[PDB]
């Protein structure tokens, strides 16, 4: 069982053109309710979204908290900013998803044999800092920029046990699936 399933739902990443992106859910948001179902863990949101879709619910309420950073002078005593939203329940039978991802850092958990990843020499346990000069925090950010790199060389910066190495790669199409891939496994 994955570890994030018990942690609170703090949005680490939102996919574009998804239900969550179009509705305005941003990274750092914390989902606390949907219809109903109280949401304290990622497991709750997953099970609630499955039952809602199977029950035929197409629209429902989604309560969300948006906080962080240093308080503004005079506004330190303000109550938490809660957001009442009307979400479009993703059709779980058709494979739809809400479009939000947890906060897991891009630490590699495995490298495929012969795949263009040992090509340059990236090892498991490596922490992917940034990609192409783009500061990232989650693994889904790096997968975003493999398929829109359109075969061009991508530059990545990796921290290994203390030292920060720089490694580039260029792999693209594949005959089996038909998409771009690099050859890295999340932990």
């Amino acid at each position: 069982v994955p570890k994030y399933l018990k942690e609170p739902v703090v949005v680490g990443y939102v996919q574009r053109d998804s239900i969550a992106q179009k509705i305005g859910i941003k990274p750092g948001d914390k989902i606390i309710k949907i219809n109903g179902y109280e949401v304290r863990t990622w497991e709750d949101l997953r099970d609630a979204l499955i039952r809602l879709s199977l029950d035929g619910v197409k629209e429902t309420t989604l309560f969300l908290e948006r906080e962080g950073g240093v308080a503004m002078p005079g506004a330190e005593d303000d109550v938490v900013e809660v957001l009442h939203l009307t979400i479009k329940v993703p059709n779980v039978q058709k494979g739809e998803e809400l479009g939000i991802a947890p906060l897991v850092k891009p630490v590699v958990g495995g490298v495929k044999k012969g795949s263009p990843a040992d090509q340059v020499g990236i090892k498991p346990g490596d922490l992917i800092l940034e990609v192409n000069g783009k500061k990232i925090n989650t693994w889904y950010e790096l997968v975003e920029e493999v398929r829109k790199s359109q075969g061009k060389a991508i530059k990545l910066k990796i921290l290994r046990n203390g030292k920060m190495i720089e490694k580039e790669l260029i792999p693209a199409k594949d005959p089996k699936t038909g998409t771009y891939f690099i050859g890295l496994f999340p932990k």
Epitope: G69, P73, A75, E76, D78, E81
Partner: antibody, heavy 117, light 110 residues
Framework: EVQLVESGGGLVQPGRSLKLSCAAS????????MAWVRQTPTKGLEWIAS????????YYGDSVKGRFSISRDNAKTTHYLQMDSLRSEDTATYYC??????????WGQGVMVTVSS | QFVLTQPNSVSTNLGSTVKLSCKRS????????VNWYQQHEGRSPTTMIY?????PDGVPDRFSGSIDRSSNSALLTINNVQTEDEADYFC????????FGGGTKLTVLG
């Protein structure tokens, strides 16, 4: 909807006092801090005062030298701005504003204050 | 503590893309949130962008804010600039006190 409407402006002779009001409605007043931001065509938006949600803490801008006193009455959902020792350089449009942790989420309509003899 | 410097005026054409800059004098841009306010002629300011890039309900998606800690400058971007976008724009931040920018009068021609 959140509504903030100012009142208590007008004209004052240089050196006398005025008390601005800001009636709030459409939200839990005591849950949020209020503030006052004035505007001149020469300087633009300038922060003046700010009071915490409970009314315990107060923060003042640089242009006020202990002259202005911001308070609030959570029973009537209204906060006030006492303005003593007014000079001609205080002639501006005065907005009250509601805060949401890190910014002003809603502004009032603004009230004009003219300091002249 | 610090000030925010905006271009006093920026002229762009209808349908183009304007980038309104807000440079922080001293201190790191990311240590405090940057908020953008639109003020039409003779009207009260409304919120266009809060918490660096969050857009309130009602504001068109043509508006988007961003943070650039390299230049310590915040940018308010307006795609497909309309006639109703012609107004004043004040960036805003805070620390020990509360700081406003000088304001940028966005003129739009065409």
């Amino acid at each position: 909807e959140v509504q903030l409407v100012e009142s208590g402006g007008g004209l004052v002779q240089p050196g006398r006092s005025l008390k601005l009001s800001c009636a709030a409605s459409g939200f839990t007043f005591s849950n949020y801090g209020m503030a006052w931001v004035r505007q001149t065509p020469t300087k633009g938006l300038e922060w003046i005062a700010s009071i915490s949600a409970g009314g315990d803490k107060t923060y003042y801008g640089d242009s006020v030298k202990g002259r202005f006193s911001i308070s609030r009455d959570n029973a009537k959902t209204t906060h006030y701005l006492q303005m003593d020792s007014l000079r001609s350089e205080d002639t501006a449009t005065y907005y009250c504003a509601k805060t949401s942790r890190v910014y002003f989420d809603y502004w009032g309509q603004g009230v004009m204050v003219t300091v002249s003899s | 503590q610090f000030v925010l410097t905006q271009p006093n005026s920026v002229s762009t054409n209808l349908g183009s893309t304007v980038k309104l800059s807000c440079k922080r004098s001293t201190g790191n841009i990311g240590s405090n949130y940057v908020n953008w306010y639109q003020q039409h002629e003779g009207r009260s300011p409304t919120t266009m962008i809060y918490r660096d890039d969050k857009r309130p309900d009602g504001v068109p998606d043509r508006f988007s804010g961003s943070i650039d800690r390299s230049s310590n400058s915040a940018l308010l971007t307006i795609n497909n600039v309309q006639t109703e976008d012609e107004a004043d724009y004040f960036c805003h931040s805070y620390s020990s006190g509360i700081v406003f920018g000088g304001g940028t009068k966005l003129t739009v021609l065409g």
